[PDB]
Every structure is written in C-alpha cells, then in structure tokens.
Amino acid sequence: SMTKTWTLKKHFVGYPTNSDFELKTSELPPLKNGEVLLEALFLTVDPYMRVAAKRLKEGDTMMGQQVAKVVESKNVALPKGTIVLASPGWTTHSISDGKDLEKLLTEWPDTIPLSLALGTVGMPGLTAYFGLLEICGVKGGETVMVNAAAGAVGSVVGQIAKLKGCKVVGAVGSDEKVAYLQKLGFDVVFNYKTVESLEETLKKASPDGYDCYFDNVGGEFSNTVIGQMKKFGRIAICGAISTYNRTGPLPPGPPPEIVIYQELRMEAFVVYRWQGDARQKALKDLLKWVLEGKIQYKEYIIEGFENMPAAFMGMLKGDNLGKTIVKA
C-alpha cells in the first residue's frame, strides 16, 4: 500500500507553523512472514511531541500513537480486523512484526469510541491515574490544584480526585473550558489568562492552601502555586508546557526559601514507569469509571490526515475543547 507521512522539515522555533512540516508519500515494502500491515483509524497529538521533536533529525517522521486496523496479515495472532495501538508516528500506514503492538482491553465495549484508547482510557488517563494516586498520593479530603485542567491529562486528574473525595481547583486557558469543567463537577475553575491576580485567585479558591499540585504547566504559574502549598505538600511534576514553546530563557525556579520552609516533596514521573499488573489494573479502573459515568470524556475530532499539523498546533495553543484526535 501507499502511505502518507508527516515529517519535521525544520526544527520548531517558538510555536510550530505550517512551514515547519512536510508531507511525503512512499510505497511500503511487502509483508514478510509474521508481520502485519496497519491502517490508521485515529491518530493522537499530545504536548510531549513538542519536546520530543527536538531530538529528531530534519526529515524524520513525527512521533505519535494511533489506533489502527490490521488490513493485511501474515501473523495468525493478528488476523485481519484486529484493532491495535501502535506508535509508527504520523503515518497512514505501517508494517509491524507484532512485538511493539498492544491490543485493546478485551472488555472494550462498542458504546465508547475507539479513539478513547488514545485519551481517557489510554496514555493520558494512565498519566493522571498514577501521577495523582501514587506520586501525589491523594487519600481523600485533600485539596488538589491541577492546571491545564481541561486537557487530556488534567481533566482525568480532576475527575478521579472528585471520585476519591477531594476538592479540585482547575486552571484553564479559555472561557469555554471553564464552563466545560464546571459541568463536570470541579469545585473551582478559572481562566488563568484573564484573571486579575493569579495569586489572589488561587488564594480564594483554597484559603488554607493546597495539599497536592498536579503540574502540567510549570514556569511562573507553578512558582505562584508553590507559594500556596500546605506544609508537607506534594507536587507531581508531569509536564512543563508553558516552557516548551519558549524563545527566551527559562523563568526563575521555584523560590527555594518557600520550598524549604514548607518542606515540599516534588517528584517527577513518566507514565511509562508503570507496567504489568499495575498498568492493566489502572486501565480497567479507567474503563469502569467511564462506563459508570464517574469519568466523562469529550473529544475534538478533526477529519483528514493532512490536517494533523493544524490539529497539533491548535492543541498546543489551547484552541480545542476535548482530546484532539485526527480521524484518518
């Protein structure tokens, strides 16, 4: 089959632009025994791609995950029709020998979109699950501050927090995202771009401070939040998207005198640390919570593979309510 592929023509400077991407067509080689041919059904764009793209050489395929269907098979375990998760990058077709492939949960129902395996019941949901439950170690009754709270990770973080008996304070980048999270049952939601004083807004959202901080943004926003952590407060360091598209130098680090006096524990993590029984258990919990109504989901489906860079840039700018997904 003929395949389409998005490649990094020029390393990003600040935010990506259309000129930074280049579409290339290629013919795929024939299948050898044991291999399968995968047709992409849904591809994801995620903030981490902005950082990962710096490690690429110009001309390389952009990295990313997809839900795909086996359309040609010489592997009996993966017959035609099998749905899998694969990470060949931003490409419409690929060949795999089956080792780097994951099948969906065997209990996956036909009533939830297949693309949820890239969002709330996929990598972002697992990031929220372990970052909140093990790094922050929330145990109930605490107050959690989560930013980028309408994103793929943040929205799952807040909903798990509510389901564990927590107060949740969410910061988002648009008025539409404020309304969306209020429907979900977030205690406080505010638009960090428009508030008069971020420090006063956080103080009013939790005058006694915050037990936990699920941090996706970093930068100066996290310096202000660190000034309102309770003593022995815990910060889960997940991402720093406010810094990824920076053109200048990094902002000042968190004020060390506040950090010491409050004796904060700040641990970073990557979702891929958890595997095996622990990972399967978390995925099942995510699916159960979705079907019970305890976790709601929202998607922003963009049609057309060659619109993928536009989907990535819009996601980077906070312009899309719900998980940005490209339908092939």
Next chain:
Amino acid sequence: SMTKTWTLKKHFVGYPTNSDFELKTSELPPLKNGEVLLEALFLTVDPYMRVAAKRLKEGDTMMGQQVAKVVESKNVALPKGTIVLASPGWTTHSISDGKDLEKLLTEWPDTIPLSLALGTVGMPGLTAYFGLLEICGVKGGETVMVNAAAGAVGSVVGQIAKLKGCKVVGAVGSDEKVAYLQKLGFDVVFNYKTVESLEETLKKASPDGYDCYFDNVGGEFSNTVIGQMKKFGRIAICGAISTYNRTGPLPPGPPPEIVIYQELRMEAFVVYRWQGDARQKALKDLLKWVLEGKIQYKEYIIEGFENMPAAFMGMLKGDNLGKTIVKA
C-alpha cells in the same frame, strides 16, 4: 542583672554590612518563681540567619542559639550550674521559664569542647543526619554530591556517608577547604570557584552520575548537578545559600525536561521536624561517632560578644574553616 543584645537595625540588602546591626544594653527584671537567669558561654552564627532575619522587624533581637549556664535559679529542675541550650537570640543574658530549653546528653564528656553542641553534635550535625539518612535515604554504595561541603552541615554529611559505605563528592569555596575535606576522607574534593567547567569536573568525579544530592547552595550549581543525577535520583533540599544574599532576580530553574525524564524526587526539609526520641537518638549517634573518630570536627572560635556581626558576615562569605562560634 545587665545584658547586651544585638538587634537588626536595617534589613540586609545583599550581604549584611556593619551598619545593619546595633548593640543595646538593658537591665533584666528579677526572676519569678520557676524561672532561671542564663549567661551565654558560646553563641553560634549560621547561614539560616540570613533568611530568618528577613522576617524580623527592625529593632528586634537577632535570632540564634547558645550554650548557656544557669547563674540564678528559682526552678527546681534546673539548679544553678546547669548547662543548657537556649535560643534567646544574640544576647549575653536572658530569662527563661525552662520550657524552651534543651539539656545536654548525660553521656556528654568533658573531653570534647562544649561548643560542639552547637555544631557537629548539634543542629548542623542533626541537619546532615536526617537530610542524608531519611530524605536522601542513603543505603550504602551510592554516590552522594554535597556542596558547601566544608561547612557545618556539608562536612558532617560527607563523613556520615563514608561511614555508611558511600562515595562522596564535595564542592567547597576555598583551597584551604579542599585540603580539609581530603583529610576527612572525601573521595573527590574540588574548589567550585576555580574549576574551568563545573559540568566536566562533576562528570570526571562520577561518570555514572549521582544517586543522591545533598543541596545547601541551590542556584545554577544545582542546575548543573541536576543534569547528572541518575534516574530516580533523590535531592535533599536543605538550603540555597547562593541565593540568600542575592540582590537581583532568581536564576533560571532547573531544566524541567531533564527533571521529568530522570523522574527525580526532590524533597525539602527543616531540622526542627525531628524531635523527641528521634532527635536524642541521632545526637547520641553523632557523639558516639565523634568519640570513635569516624566524625572529625573543627572550630573557628572568635572571642568577644561585640564581634558577633563580624563573625556572622565572615561566615556568610566563606572566610572561616570550621564551625564559626563566638565565645562570650
């Protein structure tokens, strides 16, 4: 009784200067029942005073600890002659009701200087004890990076690490301090002020990276050290002295992408968290290790109460080998 007292005349701007301090004489009231009159024998000056002094109002007494002798007693538990640790600030005499007082270890011998209870077998030694053994959680075989390594805290950290079976790499601020730490048994010691590249020196000191980082300095030094932490490395955040006397804005924070990829655990602490049985047990371990020779000690005794500001400023600027102590 008459007392002398050093007070903060003007909040420090950068490093302190002489005009920021003011000496005042006053007469103390008579003792009420249950109270004692304490005469200072040894007073300590410590880096934390630079930060703590910012919370004072002008005219307040400078904070600090001292070894003192009861010269008048209406308190049955604390008769005349009793030696105690007390924290009335930079004063030659004070009155206490006994509740904020600490008694010496009953196993404290007369063969070691009394002033050691303010240094290696006092608060700085306890800071090293808990920061290294519980925050970093060293278990033997690890490689520890310690800065301000010839100071009261840093020097104890390295020596405890050696007796626990660890490699220690110490950074100090003077050539005289380099010889001192090699005599104590540090694996690598270097003068961070004079090396051509801090990054290259740390790499040659430990090509495998560092399991633990006992951080007293903060700032850019810690950004470089963070770039050489092993995966899941632990940082004990004790102080940031490179920042206490800062006049401009804070330097850039550690690169969040390195922090996340390495999944570092960075926890701050204050020595006063540990009290009761735990504190006395650690003190007994410090005294025992001192008496066994496993922990060596050095003091820089400055005579005269009226020299306390000069002793404090010299300590802040790195001009003193060993624990700075003022003999009244």
